[PDB]
Design a protein around this nucleic acid. Structure first.
Ligand SMILES: [K+]
Ligand SMILES: [K+]
Ligand SMILES: [K+]
Ligand SMILES: [K+]
Ligand SMILES: [K+]
Ligand SMILES: [Mg+2]
Ligand SMILES: [Mg+2]
Ligand SMILES: [Mg+2]
Ligand SMILES: [Mg+2]
Ligand SMILES: [Mg+2]
Ligand SMILES: [Mg+2]
Ligand SMILES: [Mg+2]
Ligand SMILES: [Mg+2]
Ligand SMILES: [Mg+2]
Ligand SMILES: [Mg+2]
Ligand SMILES: [Mg+2]
Ligand SMILES: [Mg+2]
Ligand SMILES: [Mg+2]
Ligand SMILES: [Mg+2]
Ligand SMILES: [Mg+2]
Ligand SMILES: [Mg+2]
Ligand SMILES: [Mg+2]
Ligand SMILES: [Mg+2]
Ligand SMILES: [Mg+2]
Ligand SMILES: [Mg+2]
Ligand SMILES: [Mg+2]
Ligand SMILES: [Mg+2]
Ligand SMILES: [Mg+2]
Ligand SMILES: [Mg+2]
Ligand SMILES: [Mg+2]
Ligand SMILES: [Mg+2]
Ligand SMILES: [Mg+2]
Ligand SMILES: [Mg+2]
Ligand SMILES: [Mg+2]
Ligand SMILES: [Mg+2]
Ligand SMILES: [Mg+2]
Ligand SMILES: [Mg+2]
Ligand SMILES: [Mg+2]
Ligand SMILES: [Mg+2]
Ligand SMILES: [Mg+2]
Ligand SMILES: [Mg+2]
Ligand code: NA
Ligand code: NA
Ligand code: NA
Lengths: 77, 97
RNA sequence: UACGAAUUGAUCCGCAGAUAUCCGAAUGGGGCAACCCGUCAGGCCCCUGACACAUGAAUUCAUGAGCGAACGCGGGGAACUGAAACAUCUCAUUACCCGUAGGAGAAGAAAACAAAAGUGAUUCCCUCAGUAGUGGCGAGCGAACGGGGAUUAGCCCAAACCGGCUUUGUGCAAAGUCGGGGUAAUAGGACUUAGAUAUAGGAGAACCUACUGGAAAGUAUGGCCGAAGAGCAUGAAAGCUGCGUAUCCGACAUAUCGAGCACCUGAGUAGCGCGGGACACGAUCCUGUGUGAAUUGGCGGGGCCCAUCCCGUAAGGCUAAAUACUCCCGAGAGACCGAUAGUGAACCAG
RNA sequence: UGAGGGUAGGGGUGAAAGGCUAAUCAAACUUGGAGAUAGCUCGUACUCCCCGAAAUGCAUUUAGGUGCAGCCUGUUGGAU
RNA sequence: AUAGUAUAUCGGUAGGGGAGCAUUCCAGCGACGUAGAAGGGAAAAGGGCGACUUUUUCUGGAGUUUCUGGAAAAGCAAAUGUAGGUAUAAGUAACGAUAAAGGGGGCGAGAACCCCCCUCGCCGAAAGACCAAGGUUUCCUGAUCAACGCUAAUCGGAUCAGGGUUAGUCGGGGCCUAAGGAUAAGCCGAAUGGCGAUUCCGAUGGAAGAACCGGUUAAUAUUCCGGUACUGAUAC
RNA sequence: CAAGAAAACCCGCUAAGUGUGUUACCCGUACCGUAAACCGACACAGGUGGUUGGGUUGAGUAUACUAAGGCG
């Protein structure tokens, strides 16, 4: 599943619009990558599939709170 | 429930054999017809199996048959009363059979 | 045709039980559906009985899977066609494909409308109105406010602060977890039923003579019943022949019905740039990508924007009714068809 | 040459002929959108009575179409 | 049409206007019918005109209808129009390889064709014999000749009924794997899902378990019987 | 020279731990099958994989004539 595990972000459907206003279907994809993280509280490593927006949340409230927030809303499963 | 049954004595009230009484021989419930003894004879043509024409009673539709009164000899309508239920003749009121 | 059952109550009807091979989600493993091959525990004797043995998500146990009308909500999403050509636009947020509920679903309790005059949740109907708008300002598309109705209903958290317990750092402090406190817009808060119904049943009035006729229920007399003159059947057209109808009566089962104080009031959120989408619409709402506040003297809206004034309290949640539909069950009807009609199918019918 | 597999529709496959893909191929078949659209051709059913044309002008991606005028007819009011 | 009988007018395509008939059903007031309704055949008569109507008689054997108003699935001659039936071409084409028939008996209502016999002719690396695929009772026997058989038929691969297929070794299957398929752990992806082992499935191939000759039935035969062999388990 | 499947059966290795008798389950087995029975709407001059296929003549499984058997 191509879903961010911290934010839940997935691809959205839109249009290409030309100068003559021809509209053709397109996909807006997520800036999604796999990254390894050191988890200070648990003294371990985890690998997450997150967006660049999810990394911003990790680098603001910390890893541990981000995973707790992600598990409440149902993003990590 | 039917207003007649086997062994009953009934009088024909319509048809060519009207005014004639007789005993009930067999009741065909699904077709609502009955055989009355001695009435509505037919001439059946049978092959040997010695052959010949033979006589038999043909069934009469049961709505043309009424149970004869116990006391008087005329046909009457019937009813059922608890005095299980039992049939009785509407003309005289006595129990039937 | 043949043999039997039954007034010691057969057949038949209602209710509850017993049995219920093989395939099929098919689930012990395989497989070309209705077949083949096992492990394990028992009992009979090369075989044969009778158990268990899939997977996935929770804690051995519990759960799910599959099928099936329409109505709901989500994810994707055409073209012919119209524009008397055609690309914006239209057809249409249709057809169609996929996922997934319930007896309905969705919505729903104002960060709302309005315009110094007021109404206060949502839904649905009649108007407003083919109006204001929108639009290669073409073809087209198309509101809301206000008024009249149906139905009516309102609530719960988080936080301040207090207590306990666990954990962590070092008695203190932080986090987590339960208990108490508390729930705003005129701002508020903290502290200082058991009967009825349903699925079998019981009773239920009253007609004679003559003619025609194969056969009267017809016709002509003379009677009678009516809370019953609806109907169907009976050798022709029956209130009084039969089954019924009006009315009344019934269930062993099972099913259903104070002052002060400035402590708190939801954050990668509101807002913004770039690219798209939905709104009637080629300020408002949603977001792929990059960023990013304040705290009641706050914040949001009133169709660029600023000032003033008015209205309201986002980033937590729950809620009946008035609305949508018919695979189906019961009761009915039709200035609807009557066998090349009416369903493809009155029979034997996918 | 036999058996069993595999490639599926703007796709396949082709010692290349636009060949072949179930007697169908310059884009298979089936069902649906769907009664697509057709300024084109053909067809349009009982009776009697009164009146009764046009095949011109202008414009048109128009010329075998259409809009307006001209010419017919109903009702109504005026005389011309 | 104008005036209220007089004057004028009455050929018509596209087209405009007026007035009527029939059909199905409904409301109302009413009628007809087994002493014969509807429908079908024949005949006669009517209508300013017509669409149509009425009567009589035969058939038929149970429904039908006037008037006033109301509502429509409300009228066919043609669409290379549809269904069903029946014609014409016409007693015509044709009866499906030019391998071929003749005679005597038989059963029988019936024989060019069926059965038996004698002669003739054709195939014979096949037009003979044994399997596989596919078919699924067509196999044998009795009864039958309606339909089927391109003629007739006493005959048949036809109709009905009865009967008939026998395995320790044959062919399969049980075992093994190929192409390919389904998967496990994993990977990818709006959904539906797409991939992915040394795992499993999957013969057209490999198996270390082994049979051949003869004879008997109307119809089976390494299967039944005879003779002579072989291969696993199991108990002493 | 173009360089000619796989796995199992059957034999090793360690790790971990002859005689007699009885008996041999399942499915197929008819018939057609270079055809009147299969694929072609037909009792259709077409198509349909493998094995066998006597004698004389011949190089021959060609050709001609014949047996068994099958046919007109
Ligand atoms: K199974
Ligand atoms: K709490
Ligand atoms: K195509
Ligand atoms: K009628
Ligand atoms: K015979
Ligand atoms: Mg167009
Ligand atoms: Mg459900
Ligand atoms: Mg509701
Ligand atoms: Mg303003
Ligand atoms: Mg029909
Ligand atoms: Mg060319
Ligand atoms: Mg072809
Ligand atoms: Mg095309
Ligand atoms: Mg359409
Ligand atoms: Mg069409
Ligand atoms: Mg004239
Ligand atoms: Mg033209
Ligand atoms: Mg004109
Ligand atoms: Mg004249
Ligand atoms: Mg005229
Ligand atoms: Mg022709
Ligand atoms: Mg001729
Ligand atoms: Mg000739
Ligand atoms: Mg011919
Ligand atoms: Mg000839
Ligand atoms: Mg011939
Ligand atoms: Mg042969
Ligand atoms: Mg035979
Ligand atoms: Mg014949
Ligand atoms: Mg036979
Ligand atoms: Mg074998
Ligand atoms: Mg295997
Ligand atoms: Mg044989
Ligand atoms: Mg033998
Ligand atoms: Mg193996
Ligand atoms: Mg055989
Ligand atoms: Mg022949
Ligand atoms: Mg060949
Ligand atoms: Mg050979
Ligand atoms: Mg030879
Ligand atoms: Mg030869
Ligand atoms: Na009763
Ligand atoms: Na008559
Ligand atoms: Na007609």
């Amino acid at each position: 599943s191509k879903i961010c595990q911290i934010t839940g972000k997935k691809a959205m459907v839109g249009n290409n619009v030309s100068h003559s206003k021809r509209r053709t279907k397109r996909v807006f994809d997520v800036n999604l990558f796999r990254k390894k993280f050191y988890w200070v509280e648990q003294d371990c490593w985890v690998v997450l599939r997150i967006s660049a927006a999810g990394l911003r949340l990790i680098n603001k409230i910390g890893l541990d709170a981000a995973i707790k927030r992600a598990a409440e809303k149902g993003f990590l499963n | 429930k039917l207003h007649i049954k086997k062994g009953d004595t009934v009088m024909v009230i319509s048809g060519e054999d009207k005014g004639h009484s007789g005993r009930v021989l067999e009741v065909l419930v699904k077709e609502q017809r009955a055989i009355v003894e001695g009435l509505n004879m037919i001439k059946k043509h049978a092959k040997p199996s010695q052959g010949g024409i033979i006589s038999k009673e043909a069934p009469i539709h049961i709505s043309n048959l009424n149970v004869v009164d116990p006391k008087t000899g005329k046909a009457t309508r019937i009813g059922r009363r608890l005095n299980k239920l039992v049939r009785y003749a509407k003309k005289s009121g006595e129990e039937i059979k």
